[PDB]
Amino acid sequence: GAMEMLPNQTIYINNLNEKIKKEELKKSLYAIFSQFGQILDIVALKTLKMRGQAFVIFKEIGSASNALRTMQGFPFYDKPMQIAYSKSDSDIVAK
Amino acid sequence: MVKLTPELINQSMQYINPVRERELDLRGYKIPQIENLGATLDQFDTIDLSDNDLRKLDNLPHLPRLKTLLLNNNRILRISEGLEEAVPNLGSIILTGNNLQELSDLEPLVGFTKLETISLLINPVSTKPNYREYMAYKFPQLRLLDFRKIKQKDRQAAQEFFRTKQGKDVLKEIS
RNA sequence: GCGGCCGUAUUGCAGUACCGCGGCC
Ligand SMILES: [Cl-]
């Protein structure tokens, strides 16, 4: 298997329902993940490469860890969320 | 324990959030009661009262700009009636992680004319019998419930159910 | 201009004008 990521403040979500308009997708991602902590930003595009995916950037690593553990497979707009730590640090958390 | 004060409001983060709206951050202060929100001067699209110790949703001043309420992880078990007079344009109410118990406890949300999104995840009421059906039937304008859409076919089926004797009995008991 | 329904392709690690295509009602 590939290398696992140590806990990061950013979670990567894919298998998202691609029919949902981008604005509404970000709005609903913000609402459902707001339970876990302060969210610094959400990065979601609907290009061919990046649609069906989103990065949710938390201020605290603990918030991301709970988000990942709790929401894994949650049926968001009737598709189960696939959630992982991101493979790189998000720009907005740069020192 | 804390009070929600004008100074607490003035010293909290007041910023453009990730969905481009004006948000007041009141998360994590162990606030026991809503008060003094009039001091916001109706500046915010969104108020984040996540992670406090509210036991009821009440005591709102007139805030026509307010469109999203984040109420994650409080202890809310009652909503005051008639809040649509204070916050008529409320479009989403996020009550994830609270203590609302019965379908009749949601009665106070009915008069919001623009309320298109509700989360009652991690509330006791979300596992009551007939929960999703009832919500479709009782809130005609509700579009997204616990981040699953209420489809027209869902609402048709609910309305057909509540016209049966079984459904009628369910409604009788909810009252 | 504004929707509804059905299907189909992409399962993709990013920082955004915008975002796949097709069939019915
Ligand atoms: Cl970023």
Residue numbers in the entry:
A (entry chain B): -1 to 93
B (entry chain A): 1 to 175
Publication text:
The U1A/U2B″/SNF family of RBPs is found in the U1 and/or U2 small nuclear ribonucleoprotein (snRNP) components of the spliceosome. Jawed vertebrates use U1A to bind stem-loop II of U1 snRNA (U1SLII) and U2B″ in conjunction with the leucine-rich repeat (LRR) protein U2A′ to bind SLIV of U2 snRNA (U2SLIV). Both U1A and U2B″ employ an N-terminal RNA recognition motif (RRM) to specifically recognize their RNA targets. Here, we report crystal structures of four states of dSNFRRM1 at 2 Å resolution or better: the free dSNFRRM1 (residues 1–96; dSNF1–96), dSNF1–96–dU1SLII, dU2A′–dSNF1–96, and dU2A′–dSNF1–96–dU2SLIV. Altogether with the characterization of dSNFRRM1 dynamics alone and in complexes by NMR spectroscopy and targeted mutagenesis combined with binding studies, we delineated how the intrinsic dSNFRRM1 RNA-binding capacity and specificity are fine-tuned by networks of intra-molecular interactions that modulate dSNFRRM1 dynamics, and how the auxiliary dU2A′ protein can capitalize on intrinsic dSNFRRM1 flexibility to gear dSNFRRM1 binding specifically to dU2SLIV.
As in the dSNF1–96–dU1SLII complex, the overall structure of dSNF1–96 is not significantly altered in a crystal structure we determined of a ternary dU2A′–dSNF1–96–dU2SLIV RNP. Significant differences in the shear of the loop-closing U6:G17 wobble pair in U2SLIV compared to the C6:G17 Watson-Crick pair in dU1SLII lead to a different orientation of the two stem regions on dSNF1-96. Instead, Lys17 engages in contacts to the major groove side of U6:G17, as well as to G5 of the adjacent base pair of dU2SLIV; note that an equivalent interaction of Lys17 to the C6:G17 pair in dU1SLII is not equally possible. Concomitantly, Arg49 (L3) is displaced from its position next to A7 in dU1SLII and instead contacts the phosphate of G17 in dU2SLIV. G17 is thereby pulled below the first loop nucleotide (A7), preventing dSNF1–96 Leu46 from stacking on the loop-closing base pair as in the dU1SLII complex. G13 of dU2SLIV adopts a syn conformation to occupy an equivalent position as C13 of dU1SLII, sandwiched by A12 and Asp89 (α3) of dSNF1-96 and hydrogen bonding to the backbone amide of Asp89. U14 adopts the same position in both copies of the ternary complex, resembling the minor conformation of the equivalent C14 of the dSNF1–96–dU1SLII complex, with the base occupying a binding pocket on dSNF1–96. U14 of dU2SLIV can engage in more complementary interactions than a cytidine at the equivalent position, with its Watson-Crick hydrogen bonding potential fully saturated by contacts to Lys20, Lys24 (α1) and the backbone carbonyl of Ala42 (L3). In addition, U14 is held in its position on dSNF1–96 by Arg20 from the N-terminal pincer loop of dU2A′, acting like a lid. Whereas the equivalent U15 and C16 of dU1SLII do not contact dSNF1–96, the additional nucleotide in dU2SLIV allows this RNA region to approach dSNF1–96 more closely, so that Lys20 (α1) can directly contact the phosphates of C15 and C16.
